[PDB]
Subunit: 497 residues, 4 copies
C-alpha cells in the first residue's frame, strides 16, 4: 500500500518512492458511477457490473422515456437484490437521475449531412444552408463572430454562420453557446416532470445539469418537495458562469460534479484541468462530495483496453481527491462496459495507495475551522487514531450518514465501514470516498448497548469476509452516547474478534 | 500566471486558488518532441510544426530505411534553416533517433482477419507462414518464443488490444485461445509480459542505425527496451568517440527497466517514460506509478525526463482531444516532465499541427499551475551540497529570479551545462540560453525552461564586449518574444573568464 | 486569550512576532514544580504556603542531613499536604523525591575559615588522611582514596570556581598548578572532567539511603551521576520488590552520561538535566546544547525530563529574579521540560515562597507561548506506529482537544500510564487525571499538563456508575479550579473494562 | 563540525535531538558583543584585552558620570583600538554607543551612603527639595515633582532595579508608604511606577546636553532610553540634526507603552534594544521573555538590528563563572535571533570583565552553530515582500549560494553598510566580511549579525575594476588570517556594477587564492 512512499518527508521523495511492485490494500475507497444504457440495462449485465465494482447507476434523462427509465431502475433493483440473501456480501447500489437541463438541440430514424469548412450555414429558430434548433431566443443572445458548437463541440460555427470545423451533422445534436446570455430556465417543465418521476421512483440523488448559480440549486430542491427532501442534489458545473459562481453553488448543493464534456466546450479545453483541480480542492475543503466525470475511459467504448492518457486521468482525479469517478458512453453504449468498470476499480485502488496522506491530513486539518461540534471533534480524532495504529477500518454507526461523512472529510487511508439500517443512507453513502456502506437487516435488540454491539459485530464480519482486516487487527469504532441522531461522540480502539 | 495560487501556504489552498481566468505567461518551458512520418515529413508541414512549437524531431527507426530517414533529416534541417535569416526569431530544432530495439512483430495476413473470443489460434516461427498469417495461424519473428512462454502465458498483439492465452506448447508451435479478439492486421507489435525474452538490447540492426545517427549528426538517441545499465553502456560504446556528445535517453518500457531504474538513470543522459509498451508489460493501472516515480527521480537527479505515447491519441482522427488527454498532458507537466511527446498524432495523424498547438497550450497552463513554493524547497533539500561554483551560482540565480519575479534568466553557455544546472532548480521564469554551439542549442530543448538561442555574431575582440553582445542578443530575443519589456528585471549568468565551465557571476539587471 | 493568535501562525517566525504580553494565560499550569526542602522550608507552616504557591514535588537532598532530619522533613511535608485533605476538590497531591548523594568527592577541613589560592602557585593533593583536617595553601586533602591513579588533567574545586592542572603525580601524592585561584574553604565539592572515576554509582551509603526511601514510601529517586544503563539497574535492584513502583530519574551530570544518554533513557523512568555538576564536567557554554538534546529526546520517548539547578539562583538573596533567570525558566518550558526545579532558592534562600510563585507564573506564560502547531506535528511524525490501543486513543484525544479547543482532557487512570500517554502528545488543555491510587496521584506531577486528582469515594458495585462518579469528580475539580464552565466541551478518556491498560474510549462531552 | 548533523534534520524536534556537545563550532562569531565601560574596564590595557576577547561596541551609560569622565573613557577606547591599527588585516573596528539617561526617576542622597529599609516599616516619600540630600530610613526624596498626582493608594513604587518595593498607604506634598520588600537603600537609585502615566519628556534637557556631547565626540550610535512612541524617536533624530544625521538611533523598549507601540517605533528607529531591566519592573517579570521574543522576531522580519540587554551574566560581577541560567539566557537570546548581546554591570563594575566578554563570545559561537538554518532561511524568505530592488534580490541569492556550497564567507563591498545589512537580514551561517573605506560604516556594522567589518586603508586606484579587486583581495587576506577559510575554499563575493552606493548587483562564487 505504498507505505514506504507514505513515510517520505517531502512530496518529491514520496513520488520517487512510488513502487509498482507494492500491491494496494483490498479496499477501494473512490465511488464508481456508471451510466446505464443499451449496453448495460439487462439484469445479467447489471449483476456483472455490481460484481465488477459499480456503486451508483446513473440514468441520463437527456434521452429515453419514463417507461424506458422505469424498466432500467427495475432491472438495477432486480440485479442488486439478487445478492440480498447474504447481508455480509450484499452491496447497496444507488440510483442517480441526471437531468436534461437547458439543452439546446438541433432538429429511431437518423440521417447525417456533411458540413464543409468555409461553407456558410444558416441557423433558424436539417441540411447544409439551413439548421434548426430549439432555443427560440438564440438570435438575441449571439452576435456574428460568436462561436456555435454542435455535436459535443466537434462542429464549430435568421443566423448567418461559417463552418470553421465541419463534419457529419446528424439529427437532434446538442449545441453549446460559449457563455452566451442563454435564458433557458435551469429547471424546464421537462426537468420538473423528470424530477417528480425521480421522487416517485425513490432515486437517491439528482445530477442537476447546467447549474450557474445558487438559485438554480434552490429551484431543483424546491421541485423535489417534502417527499424528495432527502434526495441529494449534485450540481453539474459545466459552463463558465458555474465555475465563477462555484462557492454559492457549493453552499446550496449536497455535492458537485465536474462535468468535463460541456465544460471543455464552454471553456478552453486546456483550462479544464484548472477548473477540475479547483472544484475538487474546494469540495474536499468543504467536506462535500465531488465527482469527476466524462471521457475518463472514452476509448474503451470501442477498445478492450484504455489509452495511457485515460489511465493517467483516472489516477490523477483520485490523487486530486475526487470522491467518485464516472463512466458515460463507456458503460451506456460501449462494447466493453464490464472492462471499463474493472479498469476504474483497479486504477482507483492504485491511486488511493499513492496518496500522500501525511501532507493531505495536515492541510485538511489546518484549513478546517475549530468547532465545538462533538461529532466533528470525534471524527478528526478517529482519523488520527486510524493513522497512529494503521487500523484495518473505521467502523461508524450512522443513521443519516452524517457521522460517516464527517470521517470521510478527513480522508483516512483505512476504509470507513458505515453500518446503517436505513437503505437510502446505505445507497447515498457511496458519494463519499472511503465509505463502504453496509446495510444491517438484523432485528433491533432489546438493550441499546446490545443493539450497538451487534451492529459492530456485523461490521467486523463484513471486514473479515472482504479481507479488509483479520482477527487480532485493530479497528476504530464510532458510536453515540444516546439512541438517536447527531450524538456520535464515542471512539473506541478495539481488536477484531 | 496563477500568482494568487502560487502564494498559498498549503497545496490544498493552492489548488483552491487555481483560476481559469488567470492567463499564463507567454513563455512555454516544457519541450515538445514530435515523431516525424508520412503526415509531417514535408518541408512545408515542418515549417508549420516549428511555428506551432515543435522543439525536437523524433525519427522512429522501427520503420523505414536509411534513405527515408536521411531525406527526413534533410527536410527537418531545410525547414529549420528557412528561419535562420533572423537570429532573433530563429528556433533551434533537435533531431532524435529512436532505436527499433528488441521488437517482436507479426507476419503478413493491409488485410485483416477477425479474431473471435474463444476461437483457437496457433503461433509459429516457421517462415512458410511468414506471409500466410490468418485467423488459424499467426507467424512472428521471435524464433525462440516457444522456449520462453509456458501454458497459461499471455501473448499480446497490436498495442495489447488482442490477447491470446497459451493452451498447448509444441516443439515449434503454440496453440492459443483468443481471450480478447478484434481485427488482426499485418506486422503488429507483440508483447510477452513475464516471459524470459532473450533478445539483445542492441541488435546488429541497432548498431547500424546508431552509426548512421553519428554520421547524420543527430542530437540524441532514444534507446528502446533498456533493462539495465549494461544496455546503456552498449549504446554509449557503439556511438564511440565521434558520437560522444550525443545524448542517450533510455526508454523505460518494461518491468525490468522499472526495477533497475536507479542504475539506468545513473548510466543515461536522460529518461523516456515510454508508456505504450510499459502499459502492456506492466498492468495498465500501474503506469501512472512508474511515470510519477521516474519523473520524481529524474528531477531529483537533474537529468531530463520525457513523458511519451498516447498523450493526445484521439487527435490522430479528431481535431480536438478528449478530456482525459487534456488532463494527461497537464499532469505530466505538473509531475515535472522536461518534455512531452507526440507519436501517431504527428507521424500519421490527420491533425499534426493542431496536436502540437494543443500540447503548447496545455503546457503553458500547467506551468502556471506549478506550486513553486513547495517544489523549489523540496528540490533544494534533496540536492546534495557541492563545491562546484557553477551549482551555487545557479541555485542563487533561481532564488533571485523568484525574489524579484524576473522576466527571464539569461545564461551564456558553451556546453549547455550552466543552463542545465539552472533548469534543475525549476525557475518559473524562462532560461534564455545563449550559445554559439549549434548542437548545444539543439540539445538544450531536453531541459524544462531552457529557451535556446543561437548567436551567429563573430567573436568580438574585447571579451567583456563579446559577453555584452551575447547578453544584448538575449535581451532582444526576450523583448521580441514578449517574455519581458524594457525596464523589467532579468537575471544574467556569466563566467569570470573566456572558455567553458567558469560560470560564477550572477547579475540582476534592467532590460535596456 | 492564551496567545491563540500566535498559535495560528503558519511559521515559527510569525508565531514569535505575534507573542502578546497583553494576552493573559489560562488558569491551568502544566509544568511541574520541584522544590528542594531545607532549613528555609522544612516547617509545616512554610510547606503549607509552598503548596499554596504551587509546589508539586518535595525534593530531599541526601548529600546532607541524617535519616532523622529527613524523616522529620517527610513527616512535615505530609502534615502540610494532608491539612488540605478535608476538601478533595481543592486538595493537591504532593510527591516526595529522594535525591541520592552518589559518588561525591569532597575536600577536607582547612574551623570553617579559608585559605587564599594564588594563580600560578603550586598545590599538593593528597589522600593521606594525615592532612584530612590540615588542608592549607600548600596541601589539599580529599576523600577519593583512588585519585592518584585516575588522574594524569584538570581538577575543579568549589562549584568549579577553583581550577587545578596536574603538573606531576606520584602514588599517595599529586602536584598541581593553580590555574584559577580564589578563596578555598572546608569540605568543598570536587569535579574530575573526563578523568575516569572508579567510585561506585551506588555506594554503601546510597544503599542505606535508598532503603530508607523505600521505608518512608517516597514517590521517586533522583539518582546522582548516572553514567550508563548498569548504574540505573543497580538503583532499581537496590529498591527491590517493595520499592518496585518508585520512579527512577537519572541525573545526567557528566560527559559520559551525555554520551550514553540513550541507554540510560531506556533503563530509567525519567531524566534530570542536573546543570550544576554538568556545567563543570562539560564547558559551561555547552550545557544548553546538552539540555535541549536531552529534553528533545525525552519528549520524543514520552519519558519525563526535569530542568534543574540555578534556575532562580539570585532569589536566594533577592525578592525578584534576574532577567536571565526569567528567560531560563521560560526557555526550559519552551524546550519542553516536564518539570522545573528549585535548589538553593527553596532549601536555604530568604525568599522560598516568591521563588515557587515565580516559577508558577513564568511557566504559565511560557505554556501559552508554545507553538503547538509545529510541536504536535513533529511529535506525531517521530512517534512509532504501534498496535497499543491506548497510544492510538491518546493521540486521537489530543487531536480532538485541539479541534474543539476543549477545556480539559479528563483521564481515568489507575497506574498513571494512560495519562502519561496523553501528556506525551503535549495538549494545550490540562489533563485531569482521576485516580484512587495516592502514589499515582503524586507521581503524575512528573508529566507536563497532568493535574492529578485523588478520588476518595468508595468503589461502587456498578462499574459504569463508578466511572460516572469519577468523571463527575473531575468535572467538579475543573469547575472549581476555573479550567472550564458549564456548557464547555471536554474530552473524557475511559477504559472498556476495570483494571489497568484498557483505556480505549474517548468521548467529547459537555460540562454539566 | 558546526552542528551540521543537526542542521540536516527534517524537523525542529529531531534538530534538537541531534545537538552534539562534541561538535565544535566554526572560528567565526556572528553575534555582536556590546560592553558597558566603567571603573573596571576604562583603562587602555583592559580595553585592549576586551577587544582581543571579542568586544565590538563600547557602551557608555549616561545615567552616570560626567562629560569629563566619559571623554577620557572615549579617548581610552580609541587609544586601545588604534593600538592595533598598524596592521589593517588584524585591525578590528570598535563602535562607541551613547546610552541616554532618558526619563528616569531617581532618589536623593542618603553619595555612597546606605540605609537599611525594614519590611513593614513606614517610609515617607517627598518632592520637597529640603530632603534632597537628607534621605534616610524615614524619608525618601525623589526628582519626579508630579509623583503625588500620578500614583494612588495601593500603588507600588519600585526602587533600585525593583529590589526595594513600597506600597502607597496614604496620599498627601508627600506619600506614606509601607516597605514590602526591604534591603540596603543607597543614593540616586532608579524609581519605577508600573502603570502610572508619567509626563516626563522623552528627551530631557540633560539628554540634549549628552546627545550634543555625543555628536561632538563622534559616537556611532545612540541607545535612546524609554522610547514610548515614534514621535520620541523623531525627537532624538531631530536633536542630532544635520551634523549627527548618520548616527544610528537604537530605541530601548523598556515600558508597557513601548511594547504596545513597537511597530511605529521599529519603523522610526535604526534598530531596537530589548532593555530587560526596566522592562521587567514596568511589566510583570514573567512576561519579559514574551516581549523579548516578540521584538527579536519582528526586528528579524524587518531586517533591523536587535540587542538583547541587561543581566545576561549578572553573577559574573562577583564570580569568575556564570550560573547555568545565565549560560542558557545568552544562548537563547542568540537562538531567538538577537544581532547583539550586551554586558552591563559585568564589564562596567564587575571583578571579572574579561571573563564575561570571553563567556559571551563562547556561548554565542555555540548557539550560532545550533541555529536551525533550514527553517529560519525558509521562513525569512516566505515573510519577506517581493520587491524590484536589485540589491535585495542579489543579497538573498548570495545567502542561498552560501548555503549551497557551504561557503567560508560572504565578502561584501559596501560604502554605507546597506548592502551588507541586506545580506545579514537573510541570516547566512557563513560570516559576512564587509569591506569599507568609511570608518563609521565599519564601526556601525557591528549592530548586524554575521557582519565582520574590515576597514580598507589602501588609496583609491584609478581603475575602478582594480580598486574593486584590491578590496576583494583585502577581504581574502582577512578571512585567511582570521581562520574563516583556507586557500582553495569557496567564498561568495558581492560587488556593484558602477562606483557609488546602491548599485550592488553582482554576485560571484570564487575560490580563495
Ligand atoms: O548535582 C546536581 O544535581 C547538579 O549538578 O545540578
Ligand atoms: O535601561 C536598561 O538597559 C534596562 O532597563 O535594561
Ligand atoms: Mg452535460
Ligand atoms: Mg532604563
Amino acid at each position: 500500500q505504498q507505505l514506504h512512499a507514505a513515510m517520505a518527508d517531502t512530496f518529491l521523495e514520496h513520488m520517487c518512492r512510488l513502487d509498482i511492485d507494492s500491491p494496494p490494500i483490498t479496499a477501494r475507497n473512490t465511488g464508481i458511477i456508471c451510466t446505464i444504457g443499451p449496453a448495460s440495462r439487462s439484469v445479467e449485465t447489471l449483476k456483472e457490473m455490481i460484481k465488477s465494482g459499480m456503486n451508483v447507476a446513473r440514468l441520463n434523462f437527456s434521452h429515453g422515456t419514463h417507461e424506458y427509465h422505469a424498466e432500467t431502475i427495475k432491472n438495477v433493483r432486480t440485479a442488486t437484490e439478487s445478492f440480498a440473501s447474504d447481508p455480509i456480501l450484499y452491496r447497496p447500489v444507488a440510483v442517480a437521475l441526471d437531468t436534461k437541463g437547458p439543452e439546446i438541440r438541433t432538429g429511431s430514424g437518423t440521417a447525417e449531412v456533411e458540413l464543409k469548412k468555409g461553407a456558410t450555414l444558416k441557423i433558424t429558430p436539417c441540411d447544409e444552408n439551413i439548421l434548426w434548433l430549439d432555443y427560440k431566443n438564440i438570435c438575441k443572445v449571439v452576435e456574428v463572430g460568436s462561436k456555435i458548437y454542435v455535436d459535443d463541440g466537434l462542429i464549430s460555427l435568421f443566423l448567418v454562420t461559417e463552418v470553421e470545423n465541419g463534419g457529419s451533422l446528424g439529427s437532434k445534436k446538442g449545441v453549446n453557446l460559449p457563455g452566451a446570455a442563454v435564458d433557458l430556465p435551469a429547471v424546464s417543465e421537462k426537468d420538473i416532470q423528470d424530477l417528480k418521476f425521480g421522487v416517485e421512483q425513490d432515486v437517491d440523488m439528482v445530477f442537476a445539469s447546467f447549474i450557474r448559480k445558487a438559485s438554480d440549486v434552490h429551484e431543483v430542491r424546491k421541485v423535489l418537495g417534502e417527499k424528495g427532501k432527502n434526495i441529494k442534489i449534485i450540481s453539474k458545473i459545466e459552463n463558465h458562469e458555474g465555475v465563477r459562481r462555484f462557492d454559492e453553488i457549493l453552499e446550496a448543493s449536497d455535492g458537485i460534479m465536474v462535468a468535463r464534456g460541456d465544460l471543455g466546450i464552454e471553456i478552453p479545453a486546456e483550462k479544464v484541468f484548472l477548473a477540475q483541480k479547483m472544484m475538487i480542492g474546494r469540495c474536499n475543503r468543504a467536506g462535500k462530495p465531488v465527482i469527476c466525470a466524462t471521457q475518463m475511459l472514452e476509448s474503451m467504448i470501442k477498445k478492450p483496453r484504455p489509452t495511457r492518457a485515460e489511465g493517467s486521468d483516472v489516477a490523477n482525479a483520485v490523487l486530486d481527491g475526487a470522491d467518485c469517478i464516472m463512466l458515460s458512453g463507456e458503460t451506456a453504449k460501449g462494447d466493453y462496459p464490464l472492462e471499463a468498470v474493472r479498469m476504474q476499480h483497479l486504477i482507483a485502488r492504485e491511486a488511493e495507495a499513492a496518496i500522500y496522506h501525511l501532507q493531505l491530513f495536515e492541510e485538511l486539518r489546518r484549513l478546517a475551522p475549530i468547532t465545538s461540534d462533538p461529532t466533528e471533534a470525534t471524527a478528526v480524532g478517529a482519523v488520527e487514531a486510524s493513522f497512529k495504529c494503521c487500523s484495518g477500518a473505521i467502523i461508524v454507526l450512522t443513521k443519516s450518514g452524517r457521522s460517516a461523512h464527517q470521517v470521510a472529510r478527513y480522508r483516512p487511508r483505512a476504509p470507513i465501514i458505515a453500518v446503517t439500517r436505513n437503505p437510502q443512507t446505505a445507497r447515498q453513502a457511496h458519494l463519499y470516498r472511503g465509505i463502504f456502506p453496509v446495510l444491517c437487516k438484523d432485528p433491533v435488540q432489546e438493550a441499546w448497548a446490545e443493539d450497538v454491539d451487534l451492529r459492530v459485530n456485523f461490521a467486523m464480519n463484513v471486514g473479515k469476509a472482504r479481507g479488509f482486516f483479520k482477527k487480532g487487527d485493530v479497528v476504530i469504532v464510532l458510536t453515540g452516547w444516546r439512541p438517536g441522531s447527531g450524538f456520535t461522540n464515542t471512539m473506541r480502539v478495539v481488536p477484531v474478534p
